């Protein structure tokens, strides 16, 4: 690799993500959005499901 | 998976696409699932000469 090549000849670092979906015991997921708590009003809640 | 390829072969990492980066180096299936990421890096992988 040289710093003067045409774009098609300079290097490219590359990374590919591949993962199974056989629905095996879940190992990865990341929302977990948490809202501030409200008290003394009848409110719709979702506590860990 | 991580590796470095030329800048005209980046396209070769795709399901069942022919070329010279997915013919004898490494090839992924045609029913592949996931994502791919590439970025031209010419300031750390390209020297003068």
């Amino acid at each position: 690799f040289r710093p003067t090549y045409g774009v098609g000849h300079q290097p490219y670092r590359v990374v590919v993500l591949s993962f199974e979906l056989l629905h095996a015991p879940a190992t990865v997921c990341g929302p977990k959005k948490s809202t501030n708590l409200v008290k003394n009003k009848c409110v719709n809640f979702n506590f860990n499901g | 998976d991580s590796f470095v390829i030329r800048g005209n072969e980046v396209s070769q990492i795709a399901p069942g696409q022919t070329g010279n980066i997915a013919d004898y180096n490494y090839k992924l299936p045609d029913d592949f699932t996931g994502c791919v990421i590439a970025w031209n890096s010419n300031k750390l992988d390209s020297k003068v000469g």
Partner: antibody
Amino acid sequence: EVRLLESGGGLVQPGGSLRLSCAASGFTFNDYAMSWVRQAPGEGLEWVSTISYSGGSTYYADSVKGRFTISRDNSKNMLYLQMNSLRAEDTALYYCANGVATADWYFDLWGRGTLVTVS
Amino acid sequence: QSALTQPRSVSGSPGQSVTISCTGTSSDVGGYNYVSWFQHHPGKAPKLMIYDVTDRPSGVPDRFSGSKSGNTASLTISGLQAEDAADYYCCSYAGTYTVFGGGTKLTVL
């Protein structure tokens, strides 16, 4: 990223004294040997001097021994060449180089060079 | 020479701003984005203030800034201090060579 910068050229009189400097950037200066290579008008490239990554090892070319002194300050990422008894055959463009991407003893990274003129 | 064209001299008053221009050819400034700016006092090594047209290396205040348009690069120094007085060189890495401008001596009166 990785850059080499030569410095310290100017007009000096024959038998005079000069200090060259080389400024490293984008890599671990103290992990790598540094060398000075010059190119005098009409002549090919000439290796002048090499200093190891530490500073405890200095190598010089026969054509300039005694009169040339290579040095490095690993705290400041700077390389130096002290040229004394400067002669006319020392007029040249001066380069510092190292082997960050190949090996310690090679010159793969280069500066553009600084011009030293001996009247 | 073939160096990038810089002013030979620029003057500014301390605390004020000064802009320095650097015009080259289609093989250097207008070829790649590998343009550097250097502070220099003859007899000592330049200190890298700008590499990567607009990015500052370590230890250089944001008073020094860089820009590019076409084959012309521009350095701007804000908040001039007496110690900013020096020679300033633009610089371009072009693959097969690096090339400096002829330099601008900045005097802070």
